[PDB]
Amino acid sequence: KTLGEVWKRELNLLDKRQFELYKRTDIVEVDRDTARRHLAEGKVDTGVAVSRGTAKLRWFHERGYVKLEGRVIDLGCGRGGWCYYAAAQKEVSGVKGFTLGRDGHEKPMNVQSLGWNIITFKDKTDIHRLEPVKCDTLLCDIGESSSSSVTEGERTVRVLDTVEKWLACGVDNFCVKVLAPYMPDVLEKLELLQRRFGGTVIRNPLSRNSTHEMYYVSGARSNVTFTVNQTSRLLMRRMRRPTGKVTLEADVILPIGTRSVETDKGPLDKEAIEERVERIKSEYMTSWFYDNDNPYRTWHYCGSYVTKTSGSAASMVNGVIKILTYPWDRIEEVTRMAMTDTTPFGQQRVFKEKVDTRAKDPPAGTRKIMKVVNRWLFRHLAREKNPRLCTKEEFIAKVRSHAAIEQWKTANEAVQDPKFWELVDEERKLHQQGRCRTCVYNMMGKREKKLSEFGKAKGSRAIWYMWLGARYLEFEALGFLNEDHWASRENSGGGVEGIGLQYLGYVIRDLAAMDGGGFYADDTAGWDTRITEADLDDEQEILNYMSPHHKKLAQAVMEMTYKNKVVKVLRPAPGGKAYMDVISRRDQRGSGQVVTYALNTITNLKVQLIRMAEAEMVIHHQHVQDCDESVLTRLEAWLTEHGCDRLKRMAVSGDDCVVRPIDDRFGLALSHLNAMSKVRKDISEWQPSKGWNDWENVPFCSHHFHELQLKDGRRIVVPCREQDELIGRGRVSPGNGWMIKETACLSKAYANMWSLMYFHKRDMRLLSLAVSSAVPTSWVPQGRTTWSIHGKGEWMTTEDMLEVWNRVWITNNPHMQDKTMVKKWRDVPYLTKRQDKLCGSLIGMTNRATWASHIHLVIHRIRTLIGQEKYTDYLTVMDRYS
Numbered sequence: 060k061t062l063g064e065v066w067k068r069e070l071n072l073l074d075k076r077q078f079e080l081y082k083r084t085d086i087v088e089v090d091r092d093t094a095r096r097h098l099a100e101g102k103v104d105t106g107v108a109v110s111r112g113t114a115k116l117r118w119f120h121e122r123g124y125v126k127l128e129g130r131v132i133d134l135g136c137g138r139g140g141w142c143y144y145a146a147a148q149k150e151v152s153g154v155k156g157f158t159l160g161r162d163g164h165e166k167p168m169n170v171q172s173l174g175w176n177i178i179t180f181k182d183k184t185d186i187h188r189l190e191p192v193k194c195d196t197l198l199c200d201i202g203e204s205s206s207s208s209v210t211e212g213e214r215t216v217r218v219l220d221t222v223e224k225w226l227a228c229g230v231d232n233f234c235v236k237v238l239a240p241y242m243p244d245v246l247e248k249l250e251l252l253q254r255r256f257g258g259t260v261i262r263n264p265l266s267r268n269s270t271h272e273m274y275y276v277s278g279a280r281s282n283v284t285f286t287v288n289q290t291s292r293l294l295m296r297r298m299r300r301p302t303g304k305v306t307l308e309a310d311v312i313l314p315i316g317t318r319s320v321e322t323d324k325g326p327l328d329k330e331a332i333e334e335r336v337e338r339i340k341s342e343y344m345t346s347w348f349y350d351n352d353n354p355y356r357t358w359h360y361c362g363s364y365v366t367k368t369s370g371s372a373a374s375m376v377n378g379v380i381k382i383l384t385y386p387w388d389r390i391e392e393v394t395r396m397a398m399t400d401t402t403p404f405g406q407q408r409v410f411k412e413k414v415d416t417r418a419k420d421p422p423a424g425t426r427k428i429m430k431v432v433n434r435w436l437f438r439h440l441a442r443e444k445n446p447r448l449c450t451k452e453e454f455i456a457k458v459r460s461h462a463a464i465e466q467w468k469t470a471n472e473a474v475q476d477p478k479f480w481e482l483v484d485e486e487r488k489l490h491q492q493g494r495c496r497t498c499v500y501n502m503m504g505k506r507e508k509k510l511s512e513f514g515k516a517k518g519s520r521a522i523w524y525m526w527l528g529a530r531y532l533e534f535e536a537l538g539f540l541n542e543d544h545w546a547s548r549e550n551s552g553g554g555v556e557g558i559g560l561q562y563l564g565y566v567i568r569d570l571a572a573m574d575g576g577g578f579y580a581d582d583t584a585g586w587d588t589r590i591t592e593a594d595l596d597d598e599q600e601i602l603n604y605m606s607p608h609h610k611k612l613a614q615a616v617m618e619m620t621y622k623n624k625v626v627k628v629l630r631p632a633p634g635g636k637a638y639m640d641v642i643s644r645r646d647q648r649g650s651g652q653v654v655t656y657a658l659n660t661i662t663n664l665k666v667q668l669i670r671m672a673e674a675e676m677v678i679h680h681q682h683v684q685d686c687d688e689s690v691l692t693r694l695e696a697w698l699t700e701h702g703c704d705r706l707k708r709m710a711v712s713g714d715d716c717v718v719r720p721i722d723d724r725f726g727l728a729l730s731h732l733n734a735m736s737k738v739r740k741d742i743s744e745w746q747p748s749k750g751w752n753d754w755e756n757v758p759f760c761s762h763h764f765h766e767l768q769l770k771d772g773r774r775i776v777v778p779c780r781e782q783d784e785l786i787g788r789g790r791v792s793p794g795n796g797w798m799i800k801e802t803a804c805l806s807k808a809y810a811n812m813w814s815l816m817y818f819h820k821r822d823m824r825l826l827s828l829a830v831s832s833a834v835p836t837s838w839v840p841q842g843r844t845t846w847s848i849h850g851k852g853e854w855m856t857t858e859d860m861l862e863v864w865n866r867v868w869i870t871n872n873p874h875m876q877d878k879t880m881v882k883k884w885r886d887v888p889y890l891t892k893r894q895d896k897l898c899g900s901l902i903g904m905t906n907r908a909t910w911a912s913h914i915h916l917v918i919h920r921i922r923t924l925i926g927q928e929k930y931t932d933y934l935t936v937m938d939r940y941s
């Protein structure tokens with residue numbers, strides 16, 4: 060009935076070619092081929108616009124139709140082009156982008172365009188339910204082209220109705236996609252918006268003639284019906300004259316880099332870090348400068364210098380594992396597994412999301428509770444043991460395989476040089492004088508295997524290193540916590556220090572033997588970023604149990620290194636180099652250290668202790684902001700009465716915890732947990748915690764555990780996890796373009812680990828024997844299979860896997876009384892077919908059957924690719940391969 064509807068009918072009538080000639084008739088078009096090539100090849104530092112629509116917005120921007128100012132909100136950001144264009148503008152202070160980005164639609168894109176650090180994307184979000192927030196620039200580009208004008212009208216009035224809520228909040232500028240402005244209802248709603256907010260609809264000359272879309276912008280007014288019918292007129296006159304000749308305009312190229320932001324910096328003890336920052340500043344005088352575009356909001360930024368870039372965003376595929384695991388080529392849970400982006404870019408955006416947060420200081424009463432529970436906990440941990448200095452000889456012996464770490468080229472080469480220990484003696488003297496000059500953190504990226512985000516690699520968590528001397532000073536001052544097993548289960552009740560993955564399940568099962576409610580195993584969202592200054596001062600209680608000579612050194616580490624940190628982080632820089640930024644705060648720690656694990660276990664013991672005190676109504680919510688000596692003495696007596704029992708109801712490894720409380724009130728004790736910033740991951744701040752019914756389903760150290768019965772009726776507790784995680788992690792190789800010899804040794808290492816810990820999963824045992832049947836027998840397993848401290852590496856030997864199996868499970872297992880060894884592989888049991896299927900096995904499917912029949916042809920393929928060597932057919936140790 061309307062002229063636009065006539066355009067819709069006449070448009071549907073056109074065939075393919077006439078559609079193609081009317082699509083580009085007299086429109087303005089940017090050439091996207093170069094940018095599309097850049098984004099196909101994975102280049103994210105070129106600055107090209109990530110979508111056509113960007114240019115659209117640019118038009119509206121540079122002729123006054125919309126101003127981009129202040130806080131920008133983008134409803135339906137898609138790839139994110141409008142967010143990037145807005146973020147590259149000086150007049151913009153922040154950008155929040157939301158999009159569905161699921162089920163076919165385009166997912167957000169992470170690129171280095173200018174202002175990338177002031178954008179916050181959130182996919183899998185329905186904008187129609189998102190409560191409007193106050194902003195200064197409201198953008199919306201939502202609307203799907205349909206063939207029925209009724210569909211366009213209903214979707215359009217839905218969009219405008221939702222946008223009306225966001226406009227009610229009082230926005231200065233806006234640009235809202237009106238998909239079908241020719242429909243009468245859309246005209247009425249638009250007219251009401253014109254009376255209530257101003258603005259008008261504007262046809263964008265970059266819009267293809269295949270859509271009738273116009274844009275409600277705030278920088279002009281006109282008669283809605285008149286200009287809409289004029290745009291319909293133009294679209295019809297263009298349909299009648301189908302020339303397809305396009306007007307030309309240049310595509311969008313934006314600059315790269317970060318932008319400054321409003322800061323929320325806390326106190327900084329400049330005098331404490333002055334010597335270190337001046338040493339770094341002097342060693343790199345040729346590059347030193349203060350970058351006024353640093354993205355740090357909560358970290359104090361001190362300066363930057365220039366080095367070479369490092370890390371990779373690529374994920375290398377282990378060839379033999381990927382070929383043997385072909386039936387999983389279509390599973391997303393395995394294919395989405397990849398290496399972590401260790402480039403300064405992904406490093407820096409992980410720093411943005413997770414590390415650059417602002418911490419809440421625990422309120423006064425919660426702090427007092429922390430002091431009481433902490434002091435009690437340290438009084439109980441130091442009942443038997445005595446703190447002690449660790450020796451140079453212990454350190455040199457530990458250099459066989461250590462962690463958290465230019466005159467020398469190897470650690471062993473440095474600890475053999477007396478000049479190194481001269482430097483150590485000098486920095487130790489400095490620490491004794493209350494000065495520190497070289498103990499600096501280098502925050503480099505950790506090559507981990509994570510699930511890809513969007514379809515590209517997820518950023519890399521950072522592990523903090525120090526030079527060899529600083530780690531020796533830390534080890535001398537506080538290494539006794541590790542070397543004397545302070546976090547042991549015998550010394551702490553809740554600790555699990557020393558117990559490997561093998562025997563960890565016996566702890567959970569033991570907790571299941573107790574009385575009480577369900578199991579709780581809550582993950583903390585970024586534990587290291589939530590360790591407060593209060594947690595650090597609480598951990599400094601060890602100083603009160605030391606000799607003066609020891610307390611001075613340890614105090615120097617704790618105060619000058621853990622609190623007054625100096626951290627060096629990589630950030631992308633022009634050209635092929637990178638900026639090294641020197642930043643500092645007081646309220647975080649790094650996971651790389653080996654003393655980190657002990658103090659995280661102790662502090663988590665304190666945390667779960669407090670939460671259990673709230674769950675038993677010793678303390679509760681009113682006691683958050685403050686606390687009387689009455690309830691404080693109550694808590695004291697409660698620790699006296701039940702402290703050691705509650706500790707024994709815990710399995711704590713660093714930030715991982717498993718608590719078996721008296722009752723399920725534990726799931727609702729959240730006041731102090733949230734007050735201490737130990738916020739639970741993947742849950743609402745005040746939503747009750749997920750309980751657990753069957754202990755065999757409780758997660759701990761990335762695993763769950765099952766009870767298995769051997770052929771001879773005996774029982775063992777085995778670890779298990781989703782098979783998709785094991786295969787996806789086994790399918791990825793760290794190094795670049797490696798030799799088939801390296802990745803074959805890595806594959807043999809994975810096969811040995813699967814044989815040792817995950818033998819009871821049928822695809823995993825068949826996979827192990829297949830791998831060790833395609834890899835030369837005389838080759839030695841190398842590489843890293845796990846990052847867990849509970850992975851003792853027993854599978855990394857050239858031994859027969861059956862004998863290390865009988866060793867760890869029968870010979871060296873304290874829970875196995877009868878030490879009778881198992882003779883053949885076929886006598887080693889499997890999980891129940893139900894439990895195996897429930898934990899990711901592909902048994903039953905005909906693709907795994909065909910896989911198991913044709914696995915030998917693939918084995919021969921891999922042997923051929925590796926070349927001429929001595930192989931062995933291990934598969935004969937299975938029933939159906941004799």
Ligand SMILES: Nc1ncnc2c1ncn2[C@@H]1O[C@H](CSCC[C@H](N)C(=O)O)[C@@H](O)[C@H]1O
Nearest residue numbers: 110112135137138139140158159164165200
């Ligand atoms: N219901 C919804 N809620 C949020 N975003 C949606 C949505 N439906 C579609 N979208 C997203 O909105 C995007 C529109 S493209 C417009 C945004 C911008 N021009 C750009 O892509 O760079 C699509 O990519 C789609 O993924």
Ligand SMILES: [Zn+2]
Nearest residue numbers: 495496497498
């Ligand atoms: Zn130092």
Ligand SMILES: [Zn+2]
Nearest residue numbers: 765779780898
């Ligand atoms: Zn399982």
